[PDB]
């Protein structure tokens, strides 16, 4: 039992304290006034961590760490209830997207991440309908697109305007994809619907790699 | 209530007559204590004797009678309860004989026949394990009844009027309930032919022959009974524990460390076969599935061609699972799509003479066609040519029918 054993274990748990506290407080650098309070529980442990003795560190620091966690629990509940209220009180779905793009890294903490599936699905049907509109409008072709005629008046070759059309549609789809993953978290295709929308956006993208047009033309 | 006070009066007068341990008056104290205590407690034995009548007066089987027999643990020091016990020794021994012969009937309907076979197999127990477990449970229940009779008289039940026959029934039933024969047959068969069945991991793929109409051939991986043998060894070890053949245990270990791969492969093969059944039961679908079917068979060829790739195994397994997974979703997806198409196609003679509705139908059908375009199937426009030709015929037919009818209207 080489003496440094519990020192090693202690160091890794204190690692996790600096790691996880540092993370959560570093995410609140994307902001109701519990920020300093998280830093208070953090420093509660930095003071009552008693400059990490070994014996009493076990027998007392267990409750010290736990105490800090309890303060994060309250911090969570307040942030989740707060954000669900700013989400529910958000009147626009785009506004709702802005709140999701306002807490990207906060939709990581499973504690937070659990209660949003309803709003998620509302946003998914929004994304759904708009990519469906892209299937529609892109299913109409560039020669018959009136955009070709307006672009032509703006004096471009039809070749260019056609690929501009294509490439821009691609950019809207890609923007939708980043909307999707920011909403659904980075584990996104693993999620029930993300796999589907991934496949669909990919095949839709494969029907947009226009280098052949430039080749033959 | 009535007896507690009685017993306590006897005790307190006896606690005073003991003279606080007068050994020199042990005759006086103890004998006098018995002079009063004996008679008063036997007067309590009268009410206990009413419950002695209740011993039979309560039950109908030796089980519940035995429960109340165990209830009176104080009375086994008094050979007065033994009288009614000797009276019900007959009934107790015969009822226990009833139960033991019932066990005989149960064992005679051995494990492959009894419902224990189905239930034990449902909970994934080998036939060896289920048989020997069931046998040892009956062994325990047999000795449990023997323990009941051991409590009945202690030792007189052995050379009893009928306990001499109970002993015989038990001895023959012990010889019936033997599992060393099964353990030996297990170690036997496994060491007679499963000596080579163990490490059959190399030839991963094996073609076949299936004498049926046309005499088809399928694909098969070589892990059918081995997995159950692994479960057999684990069951014997944790269950009873023998001097289990260590060579078989290590060969089982080697089968374990390669077993999940084979599971995945076997399910992929089965799903592949199921999909091929669904695909060739249809005919139009083949045109569009052709590419993916060739893809699946491309990886199937690359999987069969190699046998035992100790280094590259896991990625092939995962590639396989996803290919057949996709493939299956595509067939399901296409099936649903096609039936929506056909409800429109077969409904083209329903909405009589309405161009708007006709247009609507066609639009819906080609919405399904763009769905087909995205996850591109194989030869989609060719199949569309076919469609369009029959659509033209249903159209022109509905047309000419309405044409004639409108000629009579226009008369």
Q: Rounded to a whole number, what is the distance in Å from the CA of B375 to chain A's nearest CA?
A: 6
Resolution (A): 3.4
What token pair was written down for B318? 């995962």
How many domains does chain A fold into? Answer: 1
Mutating which of A140, A141, A203, A208 best tests the B interface, going by the most B Cβ atoms within 10 A?
Answer: A203
| Residues of chain A contacting residue B374, judged by C-beta atoms under 8 Å apart | 135, 200, 203-204, 207
CB A45 within 8 A of CB A64: yes
Experimental technique for the deposited model: cryo-EM
B210 beta partners? B216
CA angle A47, A48, A51 (to 5 degrees): 70
CA distance B306 to B201: 12
CA distance B77 to B330: 82
CB B187 within 8 A of CB B229: no
Mutating which of B366, B370, B372, B377 best tests the A interface, going by the most A Cβ atoms within 10 A?
Answer: B370
The answer to whether the Cα torsion of B226, B227, B230, B234 is positive or negative is negative
Residue B350, Cα to own-chain centre: how many angstroms? 53
State whether B370 and A204 contact (CB < 8 Å): no
CB B248 within 8 A of CB B191: yes
Backbone angles phi, psi at B220, to 5 degrees: -150, 135
Q: Which domain holds residue B179?
A: 1-186
What token pair was written down for B295? 């893809």
CB B337 within 8 A of CB B371: yes
Summary count for chain A: helices (H), strands (E): 10, 0
Q: Rounded to a whole number, what is the distance in Å from the CA of A181 to chain B's nearest CA?
A: 22
Contacting A residues, span 182-211, partner chain B, CB-CB under 8 Å: 199-200, 203-204, 207
Q: Rounded to a whole number, what is the distance in Å from the CA of A175 to chain B's nearest CA?
A: 20
Question: Tokens 């224990």, residue?
Answer: B116
CB B215 within 8 A of CB B234: no
What token pair was written down for A200? 């669909």
Neighbour tally for B232: CB within 10 Å: 21
From B370, B375, B376, residue closest to A135, measured CB to CB: B370
CA distance A151 to B106: 90
Give the N- to C-terminal CA distance of chain B in Å, as an integer.
115
> CB-based contact (8 Å) between B373 and chain A?
yes
DSSP string covering B156-211: TTTTSSSHHHHHHHHHHHHHHS--HHHHHHHHHHHTTTTTTTTTTTS---B---B-
Q: Rounded to a whole number, what is the distance in Å from the CA of A202 to chain B's nearest CA?
A: 9
| Residues of chain B contacting residue A204, judged by C-beta atoms under 8 Å apart | 374
| Residues of chain A contacting residue B375, judged by C-beta atoms under 8 Å apart | 199, 203
CB B345 within 8 A of CB B324: no
Question: Tokens 């197999």, residue?
Answer: B121
Contacting A residues, span 110-139, partner chain B, CB-CB under 8 Å: 135, 139
Range A152-170 burial, b when 16+ CB lie within 10 A, else e? eeeeeeeeebbbebbeebb
Q: What is the DSSP letter of A140?
A: S
Question: Tokens 């070709």, residue?
Answer: A148
Of residues B298, B192, B308, the one with CA closest to residue B248: B192
Task: Find, in chain A, the residue whose alpha carbon is nearest to that of B329.
Answer: A196
Of residues B292, B269, B154, B286, the one with CA closest to residue B219: B269
State whether A199 and B373 contact (CB < 8 Å): no
CB B347 within 8 A of CB B357: no
CB B255 within 8 A of CB B198: yes
Q: In Å, what is the CA distance from A111 to each residue of A12, A78, A171?
A: 23, 12, 34
State whether A203 and B370 contact (CB < 8 Å): no
HSE-CB for B258 with a 13 A CA cutoff = 22
| Residues of chain B contacting residue A207, judged by C-beta atoms under 8 Å apart | 373-374
| Residues of chain A contacting residue B365, judged by C-beta atoms under 8 Å apart | none
Backbone angles phi, psi at A35, to 5 degrees: -55, -60
CA angle B196, B198, B203 (to 5 degrees): 80
Residue B37, helix vs strand vs coil: helix
CA distance A132 to A135: 5
CA distance A100 to A87: 9
Region for residue B306 given its phi and psi (left: phi exceeds 0; alpha: psi -120 to 50; beta: otherwise): beta
The answer to whether the Cα torsion of B186, B191, B197, B200 is positive or negative is positive
Question: Tokens 């076919």, residue?
Answer: B386
What token pair was written down for A161? 């305007």
Contacts across the A-B interface (CB distance below 8 Å): 11
Q: What is the DSSP letter of A34?
A: -
Residue A143, Cα to own-chain centre: how many angstroms? 38
Chain breaks in chain A (C to N over 2.5 A) after: 31
CA distance B74 to B94: 25
Residue B21: which residues within 8 A CB-CB, separation 6 or more? Answer: B29
What token pair was written down for A21? 């506290």
State whether A207 and B375 contact (CB < 8 Å): no
State whether B374 and A204 contact (CB < 8 Å): yes
| Residues of chain A contacting residue B370, judged by C-beta atoms under 8 Å apart | 135, 139
Beta strand spans in B20-167 (E): none
CA distance B89 to B66: 11
CA distance A103 to A79: 11
Task: Find, in chain A, the residue whose alpha carbon is nearest to that of B363.
Answer: A136
Q: Rounded to a whole number, what is the distance in Å from the CA of A178 to chain B's nearest CA?
A: 21
B216 beta partners? B210
Contacting A residues, span 134-173, partner chain B, CB-CB under 8 Å: 135, 139
State whether A207 and B374 contact (CB < 8 Å): yes
Backbone angles phi, psi at A40, to 5 degrees: -75, -45
From A135, A139, A199, residue closest to B375, measured CB to CB: A199
| Residues of chain A contacting residue B376, judged by C-beta atoms under 8 Å apart | 203
CA distance A17 to A69: 10
CB B103 within 8 A of CB B142: yes
State whether B376 and A200 contact (CB < 8 Å): no
State whether A139 and B370 contact (CB < 8 Å): yes
Task: Find, in chain B, the residue whose alpha carbon is nearest to that of A199.
Answer: B375
State whether A207 and B370 contact (CB < 8 Å): no
HSE-CB for A161 with a 13 A CA cutoff = 18
């Amino acid at each position: 039992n080489p003496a440094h054993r519990k020192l090693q274990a202690r160091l890794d748990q204190m690692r996790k304290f600096r790691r996880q506290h540092e993370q959560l407080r570093a995410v609140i650098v994307r902001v109701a006034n519990a920020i300093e309070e998280v830093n208070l529980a953090y420093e509660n442990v930095k003071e009552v961590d008693g400059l990490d003795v070994s014996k009493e560190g076990t027998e007392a620091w267990e409750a010290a760490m736990k105490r800090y966690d309890e303060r994060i629990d309250r911090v969570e509940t307040r942030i989740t209830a707060r954000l669900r209220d700013q989400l529910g009180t958000a009147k626009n779905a785009n506004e709702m997207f802005r709140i999701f793009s306002r807490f990207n890294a906060l939709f990581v903490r499973p504690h937070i991440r659990g209660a949003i599936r309803e709003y998620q699905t509302q946003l998914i049907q929004r994304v759904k309908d708009d990519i469906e509109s892209l299937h529609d409008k892109f299913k109409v072709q560039y020669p018959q697109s009136q955009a070709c005629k307006m672009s032509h008046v703006r004096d471009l070759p039809p070749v260019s305007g056609s690929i501009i059309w294509a490439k821009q549609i691609d950019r809207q789809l890609t923007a939708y994809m980043k909307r999707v993953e920011d909403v659904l978290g980075k584990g996104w295709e693993n999620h029930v619907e993300g796999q589907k929308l991934k496949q669909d956006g990919d095949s839709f993208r494969m029907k947009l790699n226009t280098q052949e047009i430039f080749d033959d033309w």
